[PDB]
Amino acid sequence: AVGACVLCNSQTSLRCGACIRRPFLCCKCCYDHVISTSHKLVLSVNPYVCNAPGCDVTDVTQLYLGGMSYYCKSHKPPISFPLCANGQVFGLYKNTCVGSDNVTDFNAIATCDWTNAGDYILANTCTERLKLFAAETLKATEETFKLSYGIATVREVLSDRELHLSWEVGKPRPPLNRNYVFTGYRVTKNSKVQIGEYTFEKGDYGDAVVYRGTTTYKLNVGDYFVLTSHTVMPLSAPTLVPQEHYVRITGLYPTLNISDEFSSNVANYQKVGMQKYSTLQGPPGTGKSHFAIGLALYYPSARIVYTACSHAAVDALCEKALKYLPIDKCSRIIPARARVECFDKFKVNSTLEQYVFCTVNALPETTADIVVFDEISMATNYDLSVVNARLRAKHYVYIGDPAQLPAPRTLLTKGTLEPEYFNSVCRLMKTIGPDMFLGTCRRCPAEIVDTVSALVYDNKLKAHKDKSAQCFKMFYKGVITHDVSSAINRPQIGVVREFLTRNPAWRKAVFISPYNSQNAVASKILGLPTQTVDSSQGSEYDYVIFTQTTETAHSCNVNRFNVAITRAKVGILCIMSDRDLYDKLQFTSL
Amino acid sequence: AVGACVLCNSQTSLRCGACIRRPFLCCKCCYDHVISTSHKLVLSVNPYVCNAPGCDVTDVTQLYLGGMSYYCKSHKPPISFPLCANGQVFGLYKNTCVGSDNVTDFNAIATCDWTNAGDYILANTCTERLKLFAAETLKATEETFKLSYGIATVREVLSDRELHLSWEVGKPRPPLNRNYVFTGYRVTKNSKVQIGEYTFEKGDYGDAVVYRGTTTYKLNVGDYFVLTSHTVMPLSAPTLVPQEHYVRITGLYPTLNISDEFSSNVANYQKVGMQKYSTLQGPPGTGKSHFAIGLALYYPSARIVYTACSHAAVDALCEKALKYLPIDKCSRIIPARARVECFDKFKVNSTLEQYVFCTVNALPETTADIVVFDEISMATNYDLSVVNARLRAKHYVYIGDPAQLPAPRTLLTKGTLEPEYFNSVCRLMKTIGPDMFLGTCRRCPAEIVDTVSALVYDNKLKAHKDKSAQCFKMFYKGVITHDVSSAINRPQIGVVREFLTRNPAWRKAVFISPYNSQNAVASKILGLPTQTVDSSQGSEYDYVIFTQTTETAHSCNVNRFNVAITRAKVGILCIMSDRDLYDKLQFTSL
Amino acid sequence: NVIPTITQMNLKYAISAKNRARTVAGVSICSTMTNRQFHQKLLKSIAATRGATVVIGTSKFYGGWHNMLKTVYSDVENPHLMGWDYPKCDRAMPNMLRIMASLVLARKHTTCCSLSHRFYRLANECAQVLSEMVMCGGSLYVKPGGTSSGDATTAYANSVFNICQAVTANVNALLSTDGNKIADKYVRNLQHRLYECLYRNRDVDTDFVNEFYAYLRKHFSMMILSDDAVVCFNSTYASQGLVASIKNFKSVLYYQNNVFMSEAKCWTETDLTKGPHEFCSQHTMLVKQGDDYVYLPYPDPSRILGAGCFVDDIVKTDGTLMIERFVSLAIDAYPLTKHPNQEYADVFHLYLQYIRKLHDELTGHMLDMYSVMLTNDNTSRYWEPEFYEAMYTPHT
Amino acid sequence: FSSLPSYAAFATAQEAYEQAVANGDSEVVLKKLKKSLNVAKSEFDRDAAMQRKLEKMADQAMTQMYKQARSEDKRAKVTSAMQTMLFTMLRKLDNDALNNIINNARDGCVPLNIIPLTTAAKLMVVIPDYNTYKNTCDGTTFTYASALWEIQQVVDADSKIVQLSEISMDNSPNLAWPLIVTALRA
């Protein structure tokens, strides 16, 4: 098979076989990749190995072709010649191949292992045809990384809403939420096959799982749970289609009596309809979930494809569009496997309807008039290229706040990925600025909202309320035990229970923590309804309690701090460890 | 295929790829053309590209004929030999190709873009084969200029009688008149197929076009239009069939007392019979287009095909024939679309009738006994070749005058074209002289002819009427509105409207102005029959109102103004702009 | 596994002496590929054997016709030549005889194939060749039976069928004779043991099969090309009924082919110096070549003239483009020069003179299209009769 | 050839030989330089012929590689074409009738020849003359395969539409037989 070189797009028929993705490489580019790095295996229309009865040489700098094969020096004929010479590696289209140096970064893209921080930061500022390749090889690396994993089963039948967990000894265990799903294996005597996928979550105390189910087929101990995995297909569409402006709005025809509800965004609705792709960053709780409904009511007859990275955001958007938009011309596209407790309220799963809501992973190849991508902070470059490949539409609108939490990004372990390089769209939003940005905030008290607009934001936020005089911030040591994979702060709950008796308000509070172990133990001794810092960001509460366990760069991440303190509305007790975290904000002392 | 070189008529098998018309060229002539100009692509029976796995070399001095195909410098089989060398280019009939220098005029003809004026004066004074090749490439360039136009679309439809227009952003907009047609698309998903043949014209108010269609399809907003192309056929037949002088009339027969009205042109009828083709040149309204009908009455058995380049001229000829010839044996041949409204009083579209009237473009392949081409000023060499190809004949008669207005020549924008280069027939008329010549004025009054014998003709015409004093020359500034890319003079039209209710005998005067935009838009404000100067030629009216729209080189053209005024029969009012032009004529006061 | 297969019916665009349309069977590649892989070793082994009964792969040039005719006359006692016809051969062939031919061809797989392997190969042959789906004008019909002329083993299975019918005719001829009238005591015992081995024996008697094969080779020598057959039988035995005659072939084809073989298409030649009347559409004549007399095949002069006059393409009409076309036809028409009829001998000279005229006008046109003659021209040997005389001389 | 320094050695040896011959060097030196030039030219031609073999086998290898690949990009095209044909034929199936007749089968196996005959929704009757037409499908409805069919169209051999009133005993000579009648299962 022939194709296009990755870094010069000339015709070629080589491939770097040692790479995870096996990218096409033109002659001069292939020589520059093999003489520099440690990849010495090149695949042409036939692999470049030693075709002897007995010999196995893979290196291409040490292969000489002869007759109709390739041998090393011990097995070559009286005739020559080097496969890799004159600056080129012998392949198809030998004289249409233009070299391109930008191999000095293609080496660092192809040879890195993504463990350090800088690999992402230089896998995102490179050119487009390398923006795609870096994303592809990153996904391949993650998929192969999920092939080295721990394995459990269910101890015994324990509850109808909860199972238990019997893991193997000597291997790590994953995080537990709707993102990480798990598979049962039925190797019983007798023919390992699948019965259904269960997602797992930590139990009350000791060892337990409170889960989410896929299939009703109830196993005995005869099944054991693995992670589950899949192939990564190659991506072709660019991350962002080129920005072309339009004079007057095209293919979008404004409405009659939109509403008196969101008529202050009419300028922003038309600025959405003007360009090819628009970018709207709205501070937490400023109406972007409501702006999508307003945009759909400003161009009433345009089919709109709403999309998002995860089921939570798209389901909240679905509920809002049921509450505001017309209901019968709605279509939520569900996965066939149904890995989640999906949303069945609409007339579900008809891809030839008008308001089509879907997740990025489950988008079917179709067309639209304007597609609204939501939560671009969550989305990786793979999701952006996927949504540009599967969906062609007259307009694209990316909405989301980079100040919220990023994607999981599991491989990253050393250093902090700053927001700017979350993906291409967040880089756009920080380089030149979001095209639209709505700054008020309808949840938080006065001091916190002014100071959060003064924390990181360029001072654009305000509150239409008065401060509830029930937000606090303490500095109690909260001695650490941490004798588990995450850090815990129990005697901090001791100090908070030394309060909370003179404060009868938050007696239905939701507990949050920067650590899942302390969150898990906080739901044990007192039945506080818990919702971790990640599981927030999309809901509002009026009673929430948040404690700090440690002091580190994971304790001062102002994205996490901003996503934390903005889920309460009238009352929050909170524990600050570092004097940095008691002084960027104004609250009472106690 | 095997063909004949254009400039030497030797045998050849080569063609020039870069040339629009792809003309055959012998070996010597092809070498002379390619080694000196920028054309470097030569098509033999197989094209001369390099036959590597993938290689793109077209320059002929780079190539070799190696092995069994054409290969470039470093792809050739080790056995050569050079293609473009030894003063020749290797092709079939290699050692029989002998040409001539005219490889200095052919370079200019092939290279020139037909923008200047000298390209036409070199395309009409060259040798006879180049007179055909230059006309062919000129028609090809005129066709390929339409490829640079902007394709439309529909905004909406409030009124179904007046379409709304929307041009593509970033391309020029074609003028809106009868000459240009359009054909649509519906490219949404869902039928990238034509939707009919439409045509446009502007509206006075706002933005609107009061369209017309060949069918009655509506445009759902995605449907749109593109101006249609036209491949140009080889200029197969010579521009003028070579003349032979017979001793006596062959193929034609006289008549018994032809009439008492045509008794003067008998000698010219006999001269027409003697020669193969004849040319009749006369000042307008002297008996030219009536001479042809007299010829028909003099050769009653002879089947005759009348033709002209315009429609409104052949319609006038049709009316005259109805007045004189027996109406039973006539016809009228109309094109399939029939953009203009043609003459429907004869048995329309029956080619095999004795007297058949048609435009040049819609001529059907047939025979005749004498073919009468009329108004050769309107005709270019393409029309002469077309009429000489489709219609075989025994005798040809070309009637027309050079001092009338020539063909449009939209590409020409620098300098002026003298009469003797309008086409081959006008060149013959001005060089050696017409074969038949008749001159005097029998139509226009004494005043207008006594002024036009000062503008264009050097005090040659006496005439016959009495100056009725109904010849008026107006002074009016006439402010400019360059609206449709053809000017509109609203205050001059206002002058006319305010003094057309003061003239009870002028309620039916035809409105003449050089610009089609004002001439078309005048229909609402005064309601008179309207006519442009270019199509008014050849038709007479009892009263004319002429309005010099704007001062330019188009409306202050003495030929155009002279063919404009002399269509009056008893009186004409004209409002003028140029302080000279109003002064060179001698009319009444106002 | 059994793979059923669709075979197309293709109309044949070729020159013929009768106006009935001819159709060939285009069999699928999925059948042709596997049938090649199954049968091609034996099929190439048959085509490479000289001097056998089945003359496939034997050229008629360089003395190949004379060698064939000398092997047919393999020491028969009172030789008469005989040739018969199979009316509607490919469409009236019974399915039992086609299965018989396929099983005879598959006897070579006694070590490479198992019993079930050979059965499923036979079943694939029947499903793809014998009784298949036929595409005839965009419509699928069912073929009732009979061989299709497009399978990999068509000529060879046809040869097996031809030999089977000839052996059956000899068996019927020998058994339907009286037995009290047979004077030769050896043939009477041969008839007795033939009846025993037919209807009183269920196990193969290889000794008698060899004995009857020797009898047939001695008295009924054959030459088979897939439906053409020349026999050089003993005329005295055939008159006494001990060896098959034309009437025995007529009887066998009546009760075993469901056709009537009229004796107007079957010839008998009592004089061996004239050779077979017709074999593979070629007549035979005995000529003095060099110093010895040999058998040369000549075609119908009408066939060669029709091939010259009528073509299946518009560019075969130019002549100068196709001089090899007429060189091949003159190669085929050379033996007509030895015919006693002068109008037959003039066809070869006509072709040679047309080759010379074609080369003359080709060189004229080439010299016109250029101004130089070709440097190397070896076309002069194609209007010399020695190039064609050497085509029938046994040195190669 | 010229790239390799063997040509350089030959050229410098030839230059030295010519210079010393022009300078009138002695016979011994002349023979020495002649021998050196001879061995230099020997090395030159010995390393050359090898270049011919190099380019010949390189072009053969490149042509073989092109043939093995073009043939790999022509295989995917026919694979996709066969897949699309198979799936369109799947979508053509009369699923309910086929499901009924295949569930009635004891082994799940049925003869192919009854698959249209019991499940096809459209019947094409090709009729060579008028007597056959009168026998088999005269009228707007007829019976075949123990089913009832209604005539939806009739065309002639020219694929021109024929009306049922035109198929008569006297209008038979004016019709381009055979007639193909298309009927739908009632």
Add this chain to the structure above:
RNA sequence: UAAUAGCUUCUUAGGAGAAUGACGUAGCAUGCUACGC
């Protein structure tokens, strides 16, 4: 739309072999000459 198989003619390319001729180098055999013993 264009089957299976056989034979033949012609053309082009590649390899291998043979024969003859030419050049160059190396090895061996012989004749003549120069120097030393």
Add this chain to the structure above:
RNA sequence: GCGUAGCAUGCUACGUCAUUCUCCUAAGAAGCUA
């Protein structure tokens, strides 16, 4: 008589080139036969 050097003649081995022939394969055009 021996050793070294040079010239001439002859034989063998190897490398290069020119011509002719045979064969083996591949590709293409065509003809005939069943």
